[PDB]
Nucleic acid binder design. Structure first.
Lengths: 48, 124, 224
RNA sequence: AAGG
RNA sequence: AAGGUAAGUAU
RNA sequence: ACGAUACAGAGAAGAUUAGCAUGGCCCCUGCGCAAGGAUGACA
RNA sequence: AGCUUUGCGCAGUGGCAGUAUCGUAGCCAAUGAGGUCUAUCCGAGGCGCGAUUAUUGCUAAUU
């Protein structure tokens, strides 16, 4: 994902960064569905 | 008919009201079943009124309860059936004497007082 | 002459009715008249029921599970609401439980109040008697205030409790009893500056003796 | 399938 | 001398 | 009358496995039924 | 007119435990079941027998 790659490449010193991969998902679906959707998205990103 | 020894016998309407109050008292944990428990409640002065059946054979096994009621100033009444009285108490077995105990703050206090007034004006 | 049921009897009845219903449903399913029941699925039950399906289509499976849960909730609400007392029907049950049968007899209570000047108290008495179907009369004098109340024993008890504890000069019950038939209508709150016409009005209904008792008791209290 |  | 038999189906 | 042959040979173990609903118990919520409690309201 | 108590149903959600849940044209039981403690006091089921994966169904696999 560009938002992580550009951030890491642009970084000059180590630092702890907190993100949220369930940005607007818990407002409408359970965390069980959010995790499965995110893992599907990540699998698709890795594969192609 | 019924034994004349049971002179304070209730009519049908009062019988229904008494059985309803006995069932409500059983639901409120305010009832004692049996002649022995009625005697115990009378001796401890925690009895509102005593309901006893007119089919007890012999009836003399509960005729001591009116005397204890008079001594302790507690109203008493006779119902025509020992099987319906037992059912009202929540027990399938016949009951020949049930005692409604005194519980402060109970929601049945007004009904208990009304039944006491009805009984105390029916004996004669 | 109804027969009550013990708690064991009630448990037996409920258990055997539920068992009969379950057996009937199972027979309907086996015979083919009813489709087999689908497993009940919740959010915590989603993966345990369809993990294979939840992996491929997470949002679709989530939507299906939530649709089943919403269907169950909708069925529950429809059952509850379908069997709900109409707003007018609620009044009909209430308007009837408070209507005692005065065919057998009417219970009459007579009250004497030292002072009844407060309009709020007048409205309280009038409304409470009207709701409880307590037909009667209120006669206002300098000291005597005869409140004849006739109706049902439950309404009589409620109204006696009303002026004994809910409403505050003092309130005294003159005489509580029964008569064959009613003799007064709705609350009127007649004003009676003098005793003669108050007695005449009570004689119109044929209940002057209530006025006599109230006047005599008030005189005795004044002398005491 | 073969032996006493 | 034993306590050391596989149970078979075919030919 | 065995045995030799050809074949099989794990020649000693219900080893089962998950899901849901019922059932028991204990609340909570809604609705119905039958009873009841306490209180408020001026012309 | 609201509010609220008790009991009974009907459902919904949730929690807990499977050494336990039922069955009683068997017997006994408030005319007293059962009592180690509190006994001139306690007050309700007990026992025997039967069912069982210590309630019972479907569903999915392998078969």
């Amino acid at each position: 994902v560009e938002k992580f790659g550009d951030l890491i490449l642009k970084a000059t010193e180590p630092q702890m960064v907190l993100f949220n991969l369930y940005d607007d998902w818990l407002k409408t679906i359970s965390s069980y569905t959010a995790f499965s959707r995110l893992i599907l998205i990540l699998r698709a990103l890795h594969v192609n | 008919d019924v034994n004349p020894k049971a002179y304070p016998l209730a009519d049908a309407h009062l019988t229904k009201k008494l059985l309803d109050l006995v069932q409500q008292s059983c639901n409120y944990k305010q009832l004692r079943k049996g002649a022995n428990e009625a005697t115990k409640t009378l001796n401890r002065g925690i009895s509102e009124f005593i309901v006893m059946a007119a089919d007890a054979e012999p009836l003399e096994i509960i005729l001591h309860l009116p005397l204890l009621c008079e001594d302790k100033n507690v109203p008493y009444v006779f119902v025509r059936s020992k099987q319906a009285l037992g059912r009202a108490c929540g027990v399938s077995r016949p009951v020949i004497a049930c005692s409604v105990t005194i519980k402060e703050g109970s929601q049945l206090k007004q009904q208990i007082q009304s039944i006491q007034q009805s009984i105390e004006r029916l004996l004669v | 002459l109804g027969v009550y049921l013990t708690k064991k009897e009630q448990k037996k009845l409920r258990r055997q009715t539920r068992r009969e219903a379950q057996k009937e449903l199972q027979e309907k399913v086996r015979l083919g008249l009813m489709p087999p029941p689908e497993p009940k699925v919740r959010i915590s039950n989603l993966m345990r029921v369809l993990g294979t399906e939840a992996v491929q289509d997470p949002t679709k499976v989530e939507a299906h599970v939530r649709a089943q849960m919403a269907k169950r909730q909708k069925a529950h609400e429809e059952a509850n609401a379908a069997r709900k007392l109409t707003a007018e029907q609620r009044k009909v049950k209430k308007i009837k439980k408070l209507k005692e049968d005065i065919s057998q007899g009417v219970h009459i209570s007579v009250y004497r109040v030292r002072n009844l000047s407060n309009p709020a108290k007048k409205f309280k008495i009038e409304a409470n008697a009207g709701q409880l179907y307590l037909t009667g009369v209120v006669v206002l004098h300098k000291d005597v205030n005869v409140v004849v109340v006739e109706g049902g024993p439950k309404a009589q008890k409620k109204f006696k409790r009303l002026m004994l504890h809910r409403i505050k000069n003092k309130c005294v019950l003159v005489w509580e009893g029964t008569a064959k038939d009613r003799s007064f209508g709705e609350m009127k709150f007649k004003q009676c500056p003098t005793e003669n016409m108050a007695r005449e009005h009570f004689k119109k209904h044929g209940a002057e003796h209530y006025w006599d008792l109230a006047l005599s008791e008030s005189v005795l209290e004044s002398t005491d």
